[PDB]
Tab-separated table of C-alpha atoms (C1' of nucleotides) in Angstrom:
chain	number	residue	atom	x	y	z
A	1	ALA	CA	101.745	62.328	99.393
A	2	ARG	CA	100.269	64.813	98.166
A	3	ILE	CA	102.055	64.942	94.693
A	4	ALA	CA	105.690	65.932	95.574
A	5	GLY	CA	107.273	66.561	99.228
A	6	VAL	CA	104.302	67.003	101.841
A	7	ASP	CA	100.593	68.004	101.214
A	8	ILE	CA	99.442	70.028	98.209
A	9	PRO	CA	96.721	71.740	99.082
A	10	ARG	CA	92.581	70.596	98.308
A	11	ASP	CA	89.451	72.104	96.943
A	12	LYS	CA	91.889	74.939	94.878
A	13	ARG	CA	93.456	74.297	90.751
A	14	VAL	CA	96.569	72.758	90.144
A	15	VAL	CA	98.194	75.475	88.432
A	16	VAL	CA	98.631	77.077	92.105
A	17	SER	CA	98.438	74.279	94.648
A	18	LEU	CA	101.178	73.054	93.022
A	19	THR	CA	103.059	76.801	94.223
A	20	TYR	CA	103.112	75.461	97.389
A	21	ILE	CA	106.001	73.884	97.548
A	22	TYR	CA	109.474	75.142	97.830
A	23	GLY	CA	110.962	75.813	94.308
A	24	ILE	CA	107.496	76.234	92.157
A	25	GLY	CA	106.765	79.321	91.819
A	26	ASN	CA	104.299	80.671	88.816
A	27	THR	CA	105.833	80.284	85.604
A	28	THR	CA	107.200	76.976	86.241
A	29	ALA	CA	104.041	75.221	87.491
A	30	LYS	CA	102.451	76.591	84.019
A	31	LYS	CA	105.311	74.331	81.945
A	32	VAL	CA	105.109	71.523	84.465
A	33	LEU	CA	101.583	71.112	83.730
A	34	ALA	CA	102.846	71.819	80.374
A	35	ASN	CA	104.770	69.331	79.453
A	36	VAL	CA	102.474	67.009	80.194
A	37	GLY	CA	99.183	68.141	79.526
A	38	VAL	CA	96.778	68.357	82.514
A	39	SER	CA	94.628	71.801	83.024
A	40	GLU	CA	93.086	72.979	85.802
A	41	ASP	CA	89.171	71.952	84.729
A	42	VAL	CA	88.203	73.499	86.655
A	43	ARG	CA	88.462	75.094	90.315
A	44	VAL	CA	89.394	72.024	91.582
A	45	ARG	CA	91.869	68.847	92.084
A	46	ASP	CA	89.948	65.860	91.363
A	47	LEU	CA	92.332	64.418	89.234
A	48	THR	CA	93.779	60.454	88.636
A	49	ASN	CA	96.008	58.704	89.937
A	50	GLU	CA	97.955	58.858	86.035
A	51	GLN	CA	97.565	62.465	86.634
A	52	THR	CA	99.325	62.842	89.953
A	53	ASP	CA	101.973	60.593	89.053
A	54	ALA	CA	102.144	62.470	86.153
A	55	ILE	CA	102.756	65.219	87.597
A	56	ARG	CA	104.906	63.618	90.405
A	57	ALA	CA	107.262	62.182	88.142
A	58	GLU	CA	108.885	65.293	86.595
A	59	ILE	CA	108.680	67.227	89.699
A	60	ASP	CA	111.867	64.866	90.080
A	61	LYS	CA	113.599	66.389	87.533
A	62	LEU	CA	113.991	70.257	89.473
A	63	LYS	CA	115.287	71.064	93.038
A	64	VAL	CA	111.833	71.521	94.777
A	65	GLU	CA	112.934	70.163	97.804
A	66	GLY	CA	115.142	70.845	101.248
A	67	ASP	CA	117.669	70.229	98.533
A	68	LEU	CA	117.402	73.924	97.719
A	69	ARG	CA	117.699	75.317	101.011
A	70	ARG	CA	121.093	73.206	101.306
A	71	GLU	CA	122.100	75.090	98.707
A	72	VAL	CA	121.250	78.607	99.521
A	73	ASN	CA	122.157	78.135	103.092
A	74	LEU	CA	125.273	76.912	102.122
A	75	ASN	CA	125.908	79.489	99.251
A	76	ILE	CA	125.409	82.217	102.696
A	77	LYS	CA	128.105	79.988	104.164
A	78	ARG	CA	130.672	80.010	101.560
A	79	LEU	CA	130.003	83.938	101.366
A	80	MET	CA	130.580	84.825	105.092
A	81	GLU	CA	134.096	82.451	105.566
A	82	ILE	CA	136.759	83.385	102.481
A	83	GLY	CA	136.565	88.029	103.286
A	84	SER	CA	134.033	88.917	102.985
A	85	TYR	CA	132.313	91.729	102.531
A	86	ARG	CA	128.815	90.885	101.260
A	87	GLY	CA	129.276	88.030	104.209
A	88	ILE	CA	130.642	90.551	106.953
A	89	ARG	CA	126.835	92.146	106.066
A	90	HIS	CA	125.142	89.017	106.645
A	91	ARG	CA	126.699	88.448	109.583
A	92	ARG	CA	125.198	91.800	111.261
A	93	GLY	CA	121.633	92.430	109.593
A	94	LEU	CA	122.339	95.030	107.306
A	95	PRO	CA	121.623	95.274	103.638
A	96	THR	CA	123.995	93.858	101.630
A	97	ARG	CA	123.503	95.379	98.242
A	98	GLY	CA	124.365	99.029	99.469
A	99	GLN	CA	120.970	100.473	100.661
A	100	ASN	CA	121.904	103.810	102.869
A	101	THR	CA	120.940	102.515	105.718
A	102	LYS	CA	118.602	105.641	107.923
A	103	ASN	CA	115.318	103.798	107.406
A	104	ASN	CA	116.564	100.903	105.565
A	105	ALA	CA	116.464	97.894	107.518
A	106	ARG	CA	113.469	97.772	109.470
A	107	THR	CA	113.183	94.680	107.263
A	108	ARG	CA	117.302	93.527	107.636
A	109	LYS	CA	116.872	94.249	111.007
A	110	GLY	CA	113.632	94.181	113.157
B	1	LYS	CA	55.343	102.883	150.729
B	2	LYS	CA	52.991	105.303	152.495
B	3	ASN	CA	51.710	105.519	149.216
B	4	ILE	CA	52.936	109.547	149.489
B	5	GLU	CA	51.537	110.944	145.794
B	6	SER	CA	52.365	114.837	146.706
B	7	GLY	CA	55.591	116.729	147.095
B	8	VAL	CA	57.589	118.968	146.392
B	9	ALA	CA	61.014	119.549	144.797
B	10	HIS	CA	63.963	121.205	146.007
B	11	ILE	CA	66.480	122.634	143.929
B	12	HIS	CA	69.874	123.873	145.206
B	13	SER	CA	72.144	124.535	142.613
B	14	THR	CA	75.539	126.716	142.808
B	15	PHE	CA	78.351	127.532	140.628
B	16	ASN	CA	79.908	124.277	140.346
B	17	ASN	CA	77.330	121.901	141.694
B	18	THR	CA	73.869	120.808	141.502
B	19	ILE	CA	71.737	118.686	144.024
B	20	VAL	CA	68.113	118.161	143.668
B	21	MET	CA	66.650	116.946	146.658
B	22	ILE	CA	62.876	115.556	146.513
B	23	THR	CA	60.363	115.577	150.231
B	24	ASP	CA	57.032	115.446	150.406
B	25	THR	CA	54.218	117.645	151.803
B	26	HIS	CA	56.404	118.414	154.408
B	27	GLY	CA	59.709	118.219	155.856
B	28	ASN	CA	61.093	114.001	155.571
B	29	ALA	CA	63.036	113.438	152.542
B	30	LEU	CA	62.271	110.753	150.346
B	31	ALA	CA	64.901	110.341	147.263
B	32	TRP	CA	67.418	112.885	146.730
B	33	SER	CA	70.923	112.793	143.392
B	34	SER	CA	73.297	115.437	142.996
B	35	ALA	CA	76.017	115.497	139.694
B	36	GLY	CA	78.411	113.500	141.524
B	37	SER	CA	76.375	110.598	142.580
B	38	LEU	CA	76.362	110.366	138.926
B	39	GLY	CA	80.619	109.742	138.633
B	40	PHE	CA	80.747	112.961	136.764
B	41	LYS	CA	83.729	114.921	138.479
B	42	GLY	CA	85.457	119.089	138.383
B	43	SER	CA	84.397	121.323	136.025
B	44	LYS	CA	80.845	119.192	134.634
B	45	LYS	CA	79.336	119.437	138.103
B	46	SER	CA	77.608	122.521	136.702
B	47	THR	CA	76.762	121.776	132.614
B	48	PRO	CA	72.870	121.419	133.025
B	49	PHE	CA	72.879	117.525	131.609
B	50	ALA	CA	74.245	116.835	135.169
B	51	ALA	CA	71.024	118.445	136.119
B	52	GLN	CA	69.150	116.497	133.929
B	53	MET	CA	70.732	113.151	135.055
B	54	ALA	CA	70.563	114.239	138.462
B	55	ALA	CA	66.920	115.217	138.312
B	56	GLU	CA	65.825	111.465	136.549
B	57	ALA	CA	67.594	109.961	138.795
B	58	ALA	CA	65.398	111.881	141.534
B	59	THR	CA	62.397	111.069	139.810
B	60	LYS	CA	62.880	107.704	138.816
B	61	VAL	CA	62.758	106.078	142.761
B	62	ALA	CA	60.107	109.200	144.166
B	63	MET	CA	57.496	107.388	141.439
B	64	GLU	CA	58.770	104.279	142.551
B	65	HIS	CA	56.893	104.894	145.611
B	66	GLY	CA	53.685	106.643	143.888
B	67	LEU	CA	54.488	110.423	143.447
B	68	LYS	CA	52.003	112.793	141.113
B	69	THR	CA	52.221	116.091	142.955
B	70	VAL	CA	54.869	118.019	143.119
B	71	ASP	CA	56.179	121.778	143.669
B	72	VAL	CA	59.781	123.338	142.947
B	73	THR	CA	61.453	125.810	144.988
B	74	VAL	CA	64.528	127.294	143.378
B	75	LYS	CA	67.798	127.923	145.968
B	76	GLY	CA	70.902	128.385	144.501
B	77	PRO	CA	71.490	131.136	141.929
B	78	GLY	CA	73.484	129.112	139.076
B	79	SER	CA	72.852	127.561	135.723
B	80	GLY	CA	70.981	124.216	135.093
B	81	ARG	CA	67.753	125.238	137.703
B	82	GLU	CA	65.472	124.772	134.340
B	83	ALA	CA	66.968	122.130	132.474
B	84	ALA	CA	66.335	120.005	136.475
B	85	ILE	CA	62.388	121.167	135.900
B	86	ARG	CA	62.202	120.073	132.374
B	87	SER	CA	63.428	116.486	133.037
B	88	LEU	CA	60.857	116.704	136.704
B	89	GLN	CA	58.664	116.680	134.164
B	90	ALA	CA	59.032	115.043	130.865
B	91	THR	CA	60.001	111.620	133.288
B	92	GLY	CA	56.525	111.670	134.727
B	93	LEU	CA	56.110	113.851	137.429
B	94	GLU	CA	53.274	116.276	137.969
B	95	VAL	CA	54.961	120.095	138.552
B	96	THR	CA	52.668	122.439	139.594
B	97	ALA	CA	54.315	125.512	141.073
B	98	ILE	CA	57.928	126.896	140.102
B	99	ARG	CA	58.673	129.695	143.141
B	100	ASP	CA	62.129	131.253	143.995
B	101	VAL	CA	63.974	130.925	147.594
B	102	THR	CA	67.204	133.134	147.430
B	103	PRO	CA	68.676	134.118	150.686
B	104	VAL	CA	68.900	138.180	150.406
B	105	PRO	CA	70.378	139.526	153.701
B	106	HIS	CA	69.265	143.403	154.030
B	107	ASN	CA	72.629	144.547	154.772
B	108	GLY	CA	74.011	142.030	157.802
B	109	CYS	CA	76.928	139.995	157.084
B	110	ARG	CA	80.067	141.207	155.745
B	111	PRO	CA	81.812	139.180	152.655
B	112	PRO	CA	84.989	137.507	151.878
B	113	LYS	CA	87.980	139.659	149.837
B	114	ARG	CA	87.929	140.000	146.307
B	115	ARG	CA	90.199	137.449	144.310
B	116	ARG	CA	92.747	139.304	142.556
B	117	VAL	CA	92.471	136.333	139.444
C	1	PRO	CA	82.077	132.730	102.823
C	2	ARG	CA	82.321	136.062	104.228
C	3	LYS	CA	80.732	138.005	101.204
C	4	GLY	CA	77.927	136.407	101.636
C	5	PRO	CA	75.674	133.538	100.232
C	6	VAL	CA	76.534	131.697	96.806
C	7	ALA	CA	74.725	129.288	94.001
C	8	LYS	CA	73.683	125.971	94.062
C	9	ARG	CA	75.664	124.453	91.969
C	10	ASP	CA	73.057	122.763	89.056
C	11	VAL	CA	72.855	119.506	88.139
C	12	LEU	CA	72.378	117.883	84.560
C	13	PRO	CA	69.331	115.325	85.187
C	14	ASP	CA	71.013	111.748	83.615
C	15	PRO	CA	69.365	110.981	80.779
C	16	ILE	CA	68.250	106.860	81.253
C	17	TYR	CA	65.411	107.504	83.448
C	18	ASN	CA	65.639	111.715	83.774
C	19	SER	CA	65.619	111.904	86.887
C	20	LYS	CA	67.975	114.807	88.975
C	21	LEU	CA	68.726	112.496	91.624
C	22	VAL	CA	69.797	109.184	90.155
C	23	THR	CA	72.440	111.551	89.182
C	24	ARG	CA	73.503	112.542	92.587
C	25	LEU	CA	73.281	109.208	93.392
C	26	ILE	CA	75.740	108.447	90.895
C	27	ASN	CA	77.880	111.435	92.152
C	28	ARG	CA	77.997	109.667	95.350
C	29	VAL	CA	79.008	106.442	94.382
C	30	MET	CA	82.219	107.812	91.909
C	31	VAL	CA	85.465	107.199	93.791
C	32	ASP	CA	88.510	108.820	91.704
C	33	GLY	CA	86.520	110.237	88.966
C	34	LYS	CA	85.942	107.229	87.460
C	35	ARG	CA	82.191	107.223	86.549
C	36	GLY	CA	81.390	104.825	84.182
C	37	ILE	CA	81.994	102.183	86.975
C	38	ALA	CA	79.972	104.070	89.166
C	39	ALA	CA	77.374	104.211	86.267
C	40	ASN	CA	77.103	100.589	85.624
C	41	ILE	CA	77.000	99.804	89.764
C	42	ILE	CA	73.646	101.593	89.225
C	43	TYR	CA	72.130	100.343	86.726
C	44	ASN	CA	72.930	96.417	87.648
C	45	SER	CA	71.467	97.041	90.829
C	46	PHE	CA	67.871	98.793	89.726
C	47	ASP	CA	68.039	95.679	87.231
C	48	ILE	CA	67.966	93.814	90.391
C	49	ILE	CA	66.085	95.238	92.298
C	50	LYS	CA	62.928	95.128	89.672
C	51	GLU	CA	63.922	91.888	88.633
C	52	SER	CA	63.484	90.757	92.178
C	53	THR	CA	60.194	91.698	93.934
C	54	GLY	CA	59.948	95.123	92.534
C	55	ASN	CA	57.691	97.330	90.911
C	56	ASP	CA	60.256	99.868	89.318
C	57	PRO	CA	63.304	101.711	90.373
C	58	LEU	CA	62.176	105.073	91.353
C	59	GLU	CA	58.888	104.215	93.182
C	60	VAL	CA	60.733	102.199	96.111
C	61	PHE	CA	63.995	104.359	95.854
C	62	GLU	CA	61.717	107.519	96.026
C	63	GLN	CA	59.999	105.770	99.189
C	64	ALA	CA	63.822	104.456	100.464
C	65	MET	CA	64.836	108.731	100.376
C	66	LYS	CA	61.976	109.577	101.873
C	67	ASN	CA	62.289	106.833	105.097
C	68	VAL	CA	65.909	108.118	105.709
C	69	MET	CA	66.001	111.134	105.254
C	70	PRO	CA	66.234	113.556	108.501
C	71	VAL	CA	63.939	116.197	109.696
C	72	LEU	CA	65.575	117.665	113.211
C	73	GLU	CA	69.548	117.535	113.584
C	74	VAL	CA	71.433	119.640	116.354
C	75	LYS	CA	74.139	121.589	115.916
C	76	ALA	CA	77.607	121.576	118.993
C	77	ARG	CA	78.280	124.904	119.253
C	78	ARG	CA	80.826	127.212	121.315
C	79	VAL	CA	79.595	130.357	123.137
C	80	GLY	CA	82.579	131.352	125.172
C	81	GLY	CA	84.288	128.631	126.447
C	82	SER	CA	81.937	126.043	127.146
C	83	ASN	CA	80.701	123.830	124.379
C	84	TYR	CA	76.743	122.773	123.988
C	85	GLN	CA	74.755	121.068	121.769
C	86	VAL	CA	71.383	122.626	120.686
C	87	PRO	CA	68.957	121.382	117.395
C	88	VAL	CA	67.418	123.617	114.446
C	89	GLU	CA	65.449	122.667	111.212
C	90	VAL	CA	66.649	121.251	108.320
C	91	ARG	CA	66.466	122.845	104.778
C	92	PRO	CA	65.511	120.739	101.782
C	93	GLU	CA	68.633	120.729	99.907
C	94	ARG	CA	70.792	118.893	103.004
C	95	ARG	CA	68.507	116.955	103.836
C	96	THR	CA	68.156	114.674	100.674
C	97	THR	CA	72.632	115.790	100.884
C	98	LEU	CA	72.667	113.513	104.483
C	99	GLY	CA	70.193	110.833	103.034
C	100	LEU	CA	71.880	109.747	99.955
C	101	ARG	CA	75.463	110.213	101.993
C	102	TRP	CA	73.856	107.726	104.803
C	103	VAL	CA	72.945	105.131	102.222
C	104	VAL	CA	75.949	104.704	100.398
C	105	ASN	CA	78.599	104.705	103.690
C	106	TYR	CA	76.188	102.210	104.830
C	107	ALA	CA	75.792	99.667	101.818
C	108	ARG	CA	79.679	100.449	100.922
C	109	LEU	CA	80.051	97.944	104.915
C	110	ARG	CA	77.583	95.788	104.397
C	111	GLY	CA	80.107	92.837	104.077
C	112	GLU	CA	78.209	90.637	100.839
C	113	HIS	CA	80.732	90.034	96.650
C	114	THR	CA	79.639	92.779	94.947
C	115	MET	CA	78.573	96.425	95.772
C	116	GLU	CA	75.122	95.808	93.745
C	117	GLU	CA	74.512	93.027	95.997
C	118	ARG	CA	75.159	95.565	98.585
C	119	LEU	CA	73.353	99.094	97.028
C	120	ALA	CA	70.210	97.404	96.164
C	121	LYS	CA	69.592	95.244	98.991
C	122	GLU	CA	70.279	97.957	101.592
C	123	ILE	CA	67.961	100.604	99.938
C	124	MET	CA	65.156	97.582	99.326
C	125	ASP	CA	65.828	97.062	103.325
C	126	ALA	CA	65.630	100.426	103.238
C	127	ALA	CA	62.393	101.315	101.902
C	128	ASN	CA	60.582	98.745	103.907
C	129	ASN	CA	62.093	100.758	107.236
C	130	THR	CA	65.043	98.880	108.204
C	131	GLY	CA	69.099	98.814	107.879
C	132	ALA	CA	71.484	101.183	109.557
C	133	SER	CA	70.883	104.305	107.707
C	134	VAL	CA	66.860	104.666	109.355
C	135	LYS	CA	68.707	103.405	112.289
C	136	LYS	CA	70.800	106.520	111.786
C	137	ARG	CA	67.600	108.677	111.613
C	138	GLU	CA	66.526	108.190	114.279
C	139	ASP	CA	69.882	107.958	116.548
C	140	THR	CA	69.592	111.654	115.410
C	141	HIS	CA	65.793	112.257	115.829
C	142	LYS	CA	66.595	111.130	119.761
C	143	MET	CA	69.792	113.383	120.340
C	144	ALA	CA	66.974	116.207	119.463
C	145	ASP	CA	63.927	116.304	121.277
C	146	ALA	CA	66.275	115.451	124.256
C	147	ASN	CA	69.113	118.268	123.665
C	148	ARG	CA	66.247	121.006	123.295
C	149	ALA	CA	67.496	120.882	127.020
C	150	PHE	CA	69.734	123.595	126.638
C	151	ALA	CA	68.957	125.002	123.355
C	152	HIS	CA	65.183	126.357	124.669
C	153	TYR	CA	66.373	129.798	124.751
C	154	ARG	CA	69.414	129.064	122.442
D	1	U	C1'	84.652	93.272	75.758
D	2	U	C1'	84.492	88.597	76.901
D	3	C	C1'	87.074	84.061	81.275
D	4	U	C1'	88.418	83.094	85.454
D	5	C	C1'	89.582	83.771	90.661
D	6	U	C1'	85.652	83.884	95.984
D	7	C	C1'	86.239	87.200	101.009
D	8	A	C1'	91.160	84.239	103.038
D	9	G	C1'	97.514	87.079	105.042
D	10	U	C1'	94.854	85.032	100.190
D	11	U	C1'	96.044	83.627	92.601
D	12	C	C1'	96.235	91.225	97.977
D	13	G	C1'	101.401	93.251	98.861
D	14	G	C1'	106.686	92.821	96.655
D	15	A	C1'	110.546	94.678	100.977
D	16	U	C1'	114.760	91.003	101.242
D	17	U	C1'	117.792	87.276	100.066
D	18	G	C1'	120.619	83.231	96.177
D	19	C	C1'	122.250	81.864	90.654
D	20	A	C1'	122.070	83.421	86.030
D	21	G	C1'	122.539	87.773	81.883
D	22	G	C1'	122.721	92.890	79.492
D	23	C	C1'	123.794	98.362	78.372
D	24	U	C1'	126.475	102.860	79.318
D	25	G	C1'	132.063	102.867	79.967
D	26	C	C1'	139.775	102.397	80.762
D	27	A	C1'	137.008	100.623	84.809
D	28	A	C1'	130.032	98.881	88.144
D	29	C	C1'	134.113	95.388	95.385
D	30	U	C1'	133.108	100.054	98.540
D	31	C	C1'	128.901	103.025	94.619
D	32	G	C1'	125.093	101.899	88.605
D	33	C	C1'	120.607	100.919	86.053
D	34	C	C1'	117.541	96.907	83.855
D	35	U	C1'	116.365	91.454	82.370
D	36	G	C1'	114.751	86.100	84.253
D	37	C	C1'	113.861	82.012	87.415
D	38	A	C1'	114.022	81.313	92.928
D	39	U	C1'	111.942	83.235	98.194
D	40	G	C1'	107.854	85.788	99.411
D	41	A	C1'	108.505	90.448	105.491
D	42	A	C1'	105.641	94.527	108.023
D	43	G	C1'	100.560	95.564	106.485
D	44	C	C1'	93.481	93.753	107.063
D	45	C	C1'	92.574	101.897	106.482
D	46	G	C1'	96.017	103.515	111.347
D	47	G	C1'	95.017	108.617	119.021
D	48	A	C1'	97.182	113.568	120.393
D	49	A	C1'	97.522	116.373	116.873
D	50	U	C1'	97.840	118.262	112.052
D	51	C	C1'	97.252	119.579	105.877
D	52	G	C1'	95.827	120.817	100.650
D	53	C	C1'	91.818	122.584	98.312
D	54	U	C1'	86.000	127.281	95.672
D	55	A	C1'	85.243	124.187	89.479
D	56	G	C1'	87.748	121.573	84.305
D	57	U	C1'	89.364	123.089	90.373
D	58	A	C1'	89.889	118.390	94.405
D	59	A	C1'	91.166	113.533	93.321
D	60	U	C1'	92.899	109.986	90.070
D	61	C	C1'	95.970	108.146	84.854
D	62	G	C1'	99.816	108.543	81.465
D	63	C	C1'	103.231	111.459	77.966
D	64	G	C1'	107.283	114.437	77.296
D	65	G	C1'	112.788	117.468	78.327
D	66	A	C1'	116.249	120.655	81.063
D	67	U	C1'	120.708	118.358	83.008
D	68	C	C1'	123.167	113.764	81.171
D	69	A	C1'	128.280	107.548	78.056
D	70	G	C1'	124.956	105.882	81.799
D	71	C	C1'	121.657	107.213	86.021
D	72	A	C1'	114.871	110.129	89.205
D	73	C	C1'	109.675	108.080	93.742
D	74	G	C1'	112.923	114.762	92.680
D	75	C	C1'	111.740	118.891	89.301
D	76	C	C1'	109.490	121.606	84.714
D	77	G	C1'	105.464	121.057	81.212
D	78	C	C1'	101.236	118.669	78.606
D	79	G	C1'	96.606	116.396	78.158
D	80	G	C1'	92.261	112.061	79.948
D	81	U	C1'	87.826	110.292	83.023
D	82	G	C1'	86.363	114.529	86.705
RNA sequence: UUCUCUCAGUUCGGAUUGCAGGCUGCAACUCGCCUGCAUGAAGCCGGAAUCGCUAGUAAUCGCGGAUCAGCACGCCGCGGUG
């Protein structure tokens, strides 16, 4: 439900609808669909229950879930609680890579 | 009402406004308008277009009582005096006389100071 | 300029139909100097015209041009601090200029999925006295022949 | 030149952040350039006002080198479509 996590959209090909799960970009969808042998054919998801379970069991071997948000979150969490120059900036809404703040924070500070 | 079908247009056009009243062949008034009564303000009350739409708003009501015959007596040494006429004919009325009525004293009364702008 | 009038910028009649008007129409569709795209667009549009309820692309195009071009344009001027507008006549080259301009501008704003599905459709709607181009012409004629009031002695 | 995609904040856009690398240099934390995978912001043609340009010009597309281990959306030139 649908094929991973929740709710892969309808009416589109699989190589694009598989993008909508957090952790599957564009080349990852290609590689997943190629390790099985599923094409697009043509601009719809009219799969089979063998094709859905096929492309469902392989996603389990990746980190495409709220198991990834945990990793990213605890990474920034480890950053801000040691020193830390990067985390100090993470705690101010300021660019954390060196960006000469004259305009380059409208993204990072609204 | 009264199905008059005759009258005379009075145009009173100064430097900073314009009034057109249409009365019958004698005195009593039927329909009028002016640039101020059309939402215009300040400077614009003296452009001809104001006189255009004011003439229209007067005609459209004067011929809502039956009216063809009209004359034009123009007071008011201003600018849009002829735009008033061009709107007076081209929305239905039957202009047949133009006359100028401008008070000209024979040297009687004394006019105000000259402005130092 | 200040010295005096200037030349007229001779054009090179396109070889397909041998018509300088199609050349100017290609030149008006073109953006950024990508001319082959503009040529493909015009030729696909004419193919679409003839194939669907058509006789020849030159004929219906000329008639659409005739129905769109203006004949009375006004010019807003300044005198001494107050500005107005007055009608005037219209010389021939300006007429075809305006015609092409309006047709392309209002085909570009149609809302279908191809510039050809827009251009062919719009000049067909134009050769039948329809479309915002014809309405633009009539707006112009209505502004004129009214604002002649403060133009009668200009 | 073919094959796709179908008017959507999208197979548009590529800011920001996580992880893993490469290169120069004695050394890239403050403070370099580049690569890959993941994330996917504002932005749907911009008021008052204001700028450049008269023909291979405007508009658009790339290439080279001065400076320089490394480091260019800047500068100087070149040509293509027009």
